[PDB]
């Protein structure tokens, strides 16, 4: 029979609102003494309370900033700012859209075979490098790119050691000049300075050594395991592009140079940017290369000339996840491998809440790519660039806080963008404003008269 | 089965010497067995690494061994309007050692050589050299079949044919029963690899000090090839001898070429003229099939069988994954003029990166049951990765898949325990053949005695 609004004291309009969201207060002076002033709105109107005199706040959500989602500043969350106005113990819902607009981060480290056989291939590897940089920069604005170079272990019999002039100039006996031999040299840390990367790549020239197979696998291992030096980012796709025109030295080859110590799979570059263990440690095995590539989450791509494609295709089958492209005067083949890799990248939208007041609590419904409302969920997976997901959030206040104006943020993990929700708490009635300090009607040490009542 | 792992004997060399890199048993004219140990990073008398060789008399308590002296001085000879030069620094003397009769042959595979003529040169290159010693007389000889006096320009003008400048002769070695030294030179012919053979007697009788370039008329070297399958094959990384054509008057050679055919690897059986009789191809690229080779009759039929090690073989595992463990292939020789077939048995390592099949040693008949046995090293095997040696007993079927006994390294991490192995000789005269195991990383050798 009786409702909560009428059966709970209600000495005032403010107390009436505080009882429950369903309660309404009648300020009509013409209302008779028998009727309750705090009641359901239907009951008040049914008991001839003046419609204008009825106080019944409705909780609301107004969008303040609604910049649309970007196509191709970058707006990835919409709306950006909302004002929530809540009466005591009430809740209100609101919508948010989230779009993956920004390009995915990709790291490319380029390994250049700068041995003498590569003289006729030098233009090709410079072409490929600068094309990697320029074209992948168009594919993603969050590209970082860097490079290093290798020849072989600078020790006899790989290295020419006579006459003394041959050490600073390995081409001495051909009556020409080339650079001194070296194992592995880190040249440029992963950077977004594409013009600079292209400049340095174009400055490279060849050295020279004796035997056909080269020491590129030393370079791969070090490019993989030297995290700080190379500059790989934790939440980026990692691609290691390796170039050559020849067969490669493998573990146990080092014995021909008197080197028997197995590769330890550790970083040995350091401050001069050379592989310091080149002449003291054996080439890595395929299994150890596999372990570190996997452990560091790096994807190896062999970009090799056609004469050795089959060789590297065969090694690729022994290092799962590895792919092979053809190094030539044309960069398309290798570029497609990178574009394909990029095409496989997926992302998630995971909402987190910052600065949520004690008095507020939220509940979420996710509408992801499947276009089905999953209630309770506040994250979607499997997005690509351009995809949009939607969430419905409902905020509920506990009673009436004395703070009266608070705010929190709803932000997807890994996004700059966010939704700022401004919360106002509406506990007072409008008729309180004209409370008339002087009692007039009470006149027994009570004071004031508002919304048709004494204290 | 019956090697005693408790009462071990340890011999030790100097710190950093790599004492134990290579070893063999040596029997003197009186019949007394000692142990020859190579130590390729031993400091010479001027504090430069030259390598060295030690000759350990058998003692239960082990200990230190006397150093078998060789000449470590560089030589220069101005002759024929040329200047010949030997360079012994970092030559790795004792990288291989082998004993035959009363002779010890210790090689220095990275000994360098140059020839100068006016402003031209041969190029300073690792031709390798072997030092031969007869301890009971003091006689010394050398053999360096890859030294030449051809200038750099002539190889260029002849497309680098018969280029023996990087041979590393003595990288591997073996001596036939008749006393022919066979040397593996994997850098031969611009890294194809080659073999060099000469009778020990003729090496001694033709050597005089200071000549540097001299003729051994009875010597026989393998050939250059234009077949690209052989390029960078390192043919002669390992070598062995045996009987494989049913004619006891001829000796056959077994040669490991671990990077043959674009790193597929191969082992070849050849006659003494170097004609190929059979080729065994590797199973998996980069597995180093041919790293080690051993010859011994394991199934008691009197016909030598072949064992090949591929220490970097990767075994297939769940969800398309591969695990580098190493493998050993057993080939049993059939009757009559028939080829060796597929392997009769595959033994596979169990410890990741253990390098099982890195060394394979015929043990002779360890348990005296009539079938010969073998030991296989996994120098970084065992749960701790300290190294392990596994004994397999021969039987009618060939070998057992399950080892009869496992020897865990008694040395710390890094020792490379088992990197070298030798058996089939009874050192303490108890009637059972014993096993010597080198741990070059710990500069030591462990001796295990077979028991009744």
């Amino acid at each position: 029979g009786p409702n909560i609004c009428t059966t709970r004291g209600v000495s005032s309009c403010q107390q009436c609102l505080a009882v429950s969201p369903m309660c309404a207060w009648c300020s009509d002076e013409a209302l008779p003494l028998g009727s309750p002033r705090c009641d359901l709105k239907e009951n008040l109107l049914k008991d001839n309370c003046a419609p204008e005199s009825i106080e019944f706040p409705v909780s609301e959500a107004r969008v303040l900033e609604d910049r649309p989602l970007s196509d191709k500043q970058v707006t990835q969350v919409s709306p950006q700012r909302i004002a929530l106005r809540l009466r005591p113990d009430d809740s209100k819902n609101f919508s948010i859209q989230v779009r993956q607009v920004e390009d995915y981060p990709v790291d490319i480290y380029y390994l250049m075979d700068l041995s003498y056989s590569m003289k006729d291939d030098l233009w090709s590897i410079q072409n490929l490098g600068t094309k990697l940089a320029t074209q992948m920069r168009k594919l993603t604005s969050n590209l970082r790119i860097g490079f290093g170079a290798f020849v072989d272990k600078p020790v006899s019999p790989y290295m020419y050691i006579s006459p003394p002039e041959a050490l600073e100039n390995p081409c001495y006996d051909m009556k020409t000049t080339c650079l001194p031999m070296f194992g592995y040299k880190h040249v440029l840390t992963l950077t977004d300075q594409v013009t600079r990367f292209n400049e340095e790549v174009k400055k490279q020239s060849v050295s020279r050594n004796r035997d056909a197979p080269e020491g590129g696998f030393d370079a791969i291992m070090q490019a993989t395991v030297c995290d700080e030096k190379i500059g790989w980012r934790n939440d980026a796709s990692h691609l290691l592009v390796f170039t050559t025109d020849a067969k490669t030295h493998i573990a146990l080859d080092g014995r021909l140079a008197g080197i028997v110590q197995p590769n330890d799979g550790q970083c040995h570059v350091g401050s001069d940017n050379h592989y310091s263990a080149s002449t003291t440690m054996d080439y890595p095995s395929l299994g150890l290369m596999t372990e570190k590539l996997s452990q560091k989450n790096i994807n190896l791509i062999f970009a090799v000339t056609e004469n050795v494609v089959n060789l590297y295709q065969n090694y690729s089958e022994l290092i799962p996840g590895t792919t092979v492209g053809v190094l030539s005067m044309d960069s398309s083949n290798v570029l497609q491998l990178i574009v394909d890799a990029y095409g496989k990248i997926r992302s998630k939208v995971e909402l987190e809440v910052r600065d949520l007041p004690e008095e507020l609590s939220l509940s979420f419904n996710a509408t992801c790519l499947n276009n089905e409302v999953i209630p309770g969920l506040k994250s979607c997976m499997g997005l690509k660039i351009g995809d949009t997901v939607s969430f419905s959030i409902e905020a509920k206040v506990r009673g009436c806080p004395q703070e009266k104006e608070k705010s929190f943020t709803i932000k997807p993990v890994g996004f700059k963008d966010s939704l700022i929700v401004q919360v106002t708490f509406d506990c007072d009635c409008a008729c309180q404003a004209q409370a008339e300090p002087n009692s007039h009607r009470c006149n027994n040490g009570n004071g004031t008269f508002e919304c048709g009542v004494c204290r | 089965l019956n090697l005693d792992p408790v009462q071990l004997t340890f011999y030790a060399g100097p710190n950093g010497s790599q004492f134990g890199f290579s070893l063999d048993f040596h029997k003197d004219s009186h019949g007394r067995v000692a142990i020859v140990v190579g130590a390729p990073r031993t400091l010479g008398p001027s504090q430069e690494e030259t390598g060295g060789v030690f000759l350990c008399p058998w003692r239960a308590e082990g200990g230190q061994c006397p150093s078998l002296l060789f000449d470590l001085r560089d030589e220069t000879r101005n002759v024929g309007s040329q200047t010949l030069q030997t360079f012994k620094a970092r030559q790795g003397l004792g990288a291989s050692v082998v004993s035959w009769s009363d002779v010890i042959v210790a090689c220095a595979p990275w000994q360098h050589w140059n020839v100068l003529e006016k402003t031209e040169e041969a190029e300073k290159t690792p031709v390798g050299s072997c030092f031969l010693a007869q301890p009971e007389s003091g006689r010394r000889a050398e053999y360096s079949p890859c030294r030449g006096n051809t200038l750099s320009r002539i190889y260029v003008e002849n497309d680098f044919s018969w280029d023996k400048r990087y041979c590393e002769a003595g990288f591997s070695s073996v001596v036939t029963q008749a006393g022919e030294l066979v040397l593996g030179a994997p850098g031969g012919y611009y890294f194809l690899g080659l073999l060099a053979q000469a009778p020990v007697a003729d090496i001694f009788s033709s050597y005089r000090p200071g000549i540097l370039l001299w003729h051994v008329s009875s010597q026989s070297l393998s050939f250059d090839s234009s077949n690209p399958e052989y390029f960078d094959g390192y043919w002669g990384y390992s070598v062995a001898v045996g009987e494989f054509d049913g004619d006891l008057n001829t000796t056959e050679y077994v040669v490991g070429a671990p990077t043959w055919s674009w790193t597929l690897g191969a082992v070849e059986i050849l006659d003494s003229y170097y004609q190929r009789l059979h080729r065994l191809r590797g199973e998996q690229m980069a597995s180093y099939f041919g790293h080690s080779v051993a010859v011994t009759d394991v199934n008691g039929d009197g016909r030598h069988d072949l064992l090949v090690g591929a220490p970097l073989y990767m075994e297939s595992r769940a969800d398309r994954k591969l695990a580098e463990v190493g493998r050993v292939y057993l080939f049993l020789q059939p009757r009559g003029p028939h080829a060796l077939g597929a392997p009769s048995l595959l033994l596979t390592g169990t410890q990741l990166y253990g390098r099982f099949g890195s060394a394979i040693a015929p043990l002779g008949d360890l348990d005296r049951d009539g079938y010969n046995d073998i030991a296989v090293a996994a120098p970084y095997g065992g749960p701790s990765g300290r190294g392990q040696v596994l004994v397999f007993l021969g039987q009618s079927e060939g070998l057992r898949s399950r080892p009869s006994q496992v020897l865990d390294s008694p040395f710390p991490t890094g020792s490379a325990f088992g990197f070298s192995l030798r058996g089939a000789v009874d050192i303490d005269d108890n009637g059972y053949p014993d096993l010597i195991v080198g741990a070059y990383g710990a500069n030591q050798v462990a001796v295990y005695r077979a028991q009744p």
């Binding site: 041995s115 003498y116 050594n209 004796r210 | 497309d159 680098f160 611009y190 234009s226």
Partner: peptide
């Protein structure tokens, strides 16, 4: 084909 070095 002929040359086997780094050429």
């Amino acid at each position: 084909a002929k040359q086997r070095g780094d050429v």
